[PDB]
Symmetry: D2
Subunit: 251 residues, 4 copies
């Protein structure tokens, strides 16, 4: 990544890199997804491809592809590991409410905490150290909010205050809007490099046709592969990720 | 009731560790020793030292100690995350043994195309009245350590919040001697009695003096998204390779 | 006796995350008209930028603006982002006409060459602790005219530049890019529109400026800078002096240095 | 033209991690003699601490100390820990005899009540690090002009790591009715520093520090020079912000003098 790209990833929490994969490559990726099973993730009008690398050698190798790994290296700067690799296929009336955010809250029963160390990032001696980054590979054009554009709360990756708990305001900000909520439009083939510290989601998709992407999650070698945990287990051997406040919790 | 007091949290924050005296009684200690003598050990690579690799696996006693509330309660107060047990091991040491310095907030690591100076496994922070340290140990001592010749725990003052690397420079000059042996202006010792726990932010640069006259068990905790402790040489070409890759330690140079 | 938070949780969130906050309609049209009429009575200086007039020290020149500088409607939000014993560091006015512009300045990690090069300016280095922001240098901009399009010379800022860890301007100069980003554009350069009577509360760590003004009519604002009591009142300083008694502010890279 | 770093890698490491640095033998015995002689010919004031005399403004009072304040043996290490365009903020002297003491002051996270709120950062001493450089806005060079080799000489003391403390220390002690200074009672992380005449102690004012009670005969003597950025005002004590917000000075957070 160039100095300007590093500046932009640092200051905004993400980076769009245009035309990483060519038209030939893109259609090849579309083909494989058509020939692959999906699940209901409990999100309306949304089909998920749960584990792309363990479902297809096309995506098992994309996960290790150099166009992805190299910019990821430049923002993680740790010995690297694959944490996850999934696909999303969306139709009209689907939506992805806000999640992420550097200072959102979590009640741990006896106490309330406001840092999630899995996304807590820093900077030292000319290098970014972000522990959890996604490479989003868009396989369809998203050029207006009604295409279900990616959206993000500006600067939320470095926020010191929690946003969502005070609102719980049962309407999502991706629908109602927010003064610092901005949209990002992408072309098929583009890659969005994302600091998972960013509070982000997508607008509601109102257009017809399929919205398609493949998401790959990376972190240091001492991170576990991604897995949802309701809470820490009684015998302290339960592994996984316990999310702080997200809009799904009250919208 | 908070596990750690105001003063205790202040001390852990400012020094990187906390000795809590008399956590486990005579009988408990004797029990722990008795169980240790039962169990197999491996050659950990350090002379006059035997390592009990996976105590919770090899013994129900230490499977139970690892979850003891007297360890978990203070550990919670400095991790403040959903918790996982990352490791649990024992160390038995005789005269002539030594543990060189390791840890350090800003020690270096060569990755292959770049040099990095943060280890996120030990990178800690503070937010709204709470410490957030990702990798902490509860060291449970099973023998008295009251002098440097007992092989006392020692640490580099403030090294858990260091912004500069210390060890690479020493090696570049060719200082083959360990600071635990030679001394260092800010290297200090800690003395404990058996049954005490030393609660340790792993970001701290620490080791032990050489023993001349030694029983402890160590339990490592972190967030639920950390993998259980395993030594890793480098990232695999597979990126499925899991483990912890340490930055500079004295063992690499001494 | 009946204190109410000057800033809401959401307002603090926005100021923290973006480095500024627009507070709408702080001053009603009557007060705005009063401020305008008072500026009409005052003289200006040439600040070295074309089509710009500066009212150099408004609290010294006017009881109206001396009062404004201390108005609780400005001080109360300022206290919520500085959170130190307070000092007024400057108070000035700007009147701009067509073809005037204000190049980018500020930024958290811009460079300064001293036998060494440094990348922090401690006058704008800010932090957060136990539920409170601590920003050492903040401005309250009171707009006395409507700025509703870029062509009105809108305030613009580089997104997240108040917490930037990398320098932006030194490299653009090295690459010979000698036109301002406010004219050329930049991917994360964004505009802010305001109405007369609005206040823009600004962390001076933010890299900001304005677009070039193309429209008719006077663009008018008054700006008040605040910091801790141990900060000196604002004065430009070229370099530390030989005797180490020189006081003032030595800015890091700004676009004016090479555009 | 032939610049070598004022501070070594190790010296920077130590200053960063401990909040201070003792630089031995910076000034020779003859120079120390020159400084002592000059102080004897200058007037003091009563600073309001028992058995303590203060020379309030040495660089104004005498060209010798004006020159000392600008000596590169002080300025070069100061520059390496401030890393800003520099200004001299104060220069004073302290002469102490037996039964004198200096209670703890400083500390990164001590509290200050401001009427409608309590704050826990003092931006005059809030310091950071970036790209290989320390940025500490308020540092002192203490030039010792006598030997201090035991606690009863009134040794400098400090709370370990207090320059980077995230919690306050003094307020809770006061609330728990502990009105005995830690320099008298001790504290688990309170440490002492011994110095020789001619040594310089370079000090991050974020560090919580003071001295032990002096019991010994012979004057305890030093001169202190305070430096920070050009936009800092010269040091002046200030109780509160002023009515017109034009008042300049430094409003300290909790110090032991408030409680003990
Ligand atoms: C009832 N299950 C929900 C329980 C919530 N506590 C989770 O935060 C939520 O999960 C989140 O959902 C939001 C939408 O509301 C996004 O889908 C987030 O994106 C996810 O899940 C995130 O983020 C994860 C991690 N970034 C955070 O653990 C992984 O990357 C996953 O692949 C990814 O779908 C689950 O859906
Ligand atoms: C040849 N193998 C060595 C490879 C080095 N790169 C390691 O850093 C070193 O490992 C370290 O050894 C030092 C002694 O020189 C301490 O023993 C450290 O303490 C250890 O290993 C640490 O720290 C680990 C983690 N804290 C860091 O990975 C785990 O807790 C281990 O169980 C624990 O013994 C290994 O021995
Ligand atoms: C030769 N004169 C220029 C010398 C540069 N080194 C200054 O940075 C520049 O000063 C800056 O100019 C830009 C425009 O190019 C803005 O005007 C900045 O805004 C200023 O000057 C700032 O910022 C100052 C402080 N924020 C920074 O010291 C004060 O607020 C001033 O009132 C305010 O005009 C001067 O004009
Ligand atoms: C009733 N007057 C006291 C009021 C307190 N609020 C001050 O904190 C205290 O001032 C402090 O006193 C302690 C002793 O209790 C040390 O002397 C500190 O050191 C001082 O005063 C500091 O620190 C100042 C700055 N470091 C902080 O403002 C300057 O360096 C001074 O020259 C220096 O004496 C005054 O004495
Ligand atoms: O669909 C997008 O553009 C973003 C997807 C996302 O944020 C996620 O899957 O976590
Ligand atoms: O032996 C001790 O006292 C501490 C042991 C230790 O530091 C370790 O094994 O990591
Ligand atoms: O004119 C504006 O809108 C902002 C002016 C500004 O940034 C300044 O005066 O420094
Ligand atoms: O007397 C000393 O050794 C230190 C004095 C000091 O800390 C001060 O003057 O603020
Ligand atoms: Ni997401
Ligand atoms: Ni260890
Ligand atoms: Ni400006
Ligand atoms: Ni002092």
């Amino acid at each position: 990544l160039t100095r300007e790209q590093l500046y932009i990833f640092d200051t905004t929490g993400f980076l769009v890199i245009p035309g990483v994969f060519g038209s030939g490559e893109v259609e090849s990726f579309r083909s494989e997804l058509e020939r692959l099973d999906t699940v209901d993730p409990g999100f309306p009008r949304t089909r998920r491809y749960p584990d792309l690398p363990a479902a297809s050698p096309v995506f098992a190798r994309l996960a290790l592809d150099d166009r992805l790994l190299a910019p990821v290296r430049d923002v993680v700067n740790q010995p690297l590991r694959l944490l996850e690799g999934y696909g999303l296929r969306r139709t009209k009336d689907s939506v992805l409410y806000l999640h992420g955010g550097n200072s959102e809250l979590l009640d741990l029963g006896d106490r309330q905490v406001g840092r999630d160390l899995s996304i807590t990032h820093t900077y030292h001696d000319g290098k970014l150290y972000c522990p959890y980054v996604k490479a989003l590979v868009y396989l369809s054009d998203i050029q207006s909010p009604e295409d279900g554009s990616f959206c993000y709360v500006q600067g939320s990756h470095k926020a010191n205050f929690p946003l969502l708990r005070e609102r719980a305001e049962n309407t999502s900000l991706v629908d109602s809007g927010f003064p610092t909520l901005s949209d990002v439009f992408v072309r098929s083939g583009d890659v969005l490099l994302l600091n998972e510290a960013l509070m982000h989601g997508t607008r509601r998709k109102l257009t017809e046709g399929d919205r398609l992407l493949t998401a790959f999650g990376y972190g240091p070698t001492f991170f576990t592969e991604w897995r949802e945990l309701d809470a820490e287990t009684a015998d302290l051997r339960g592994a996984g990720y316990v999310d702080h406040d997200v809009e799904e919790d009250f919208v």
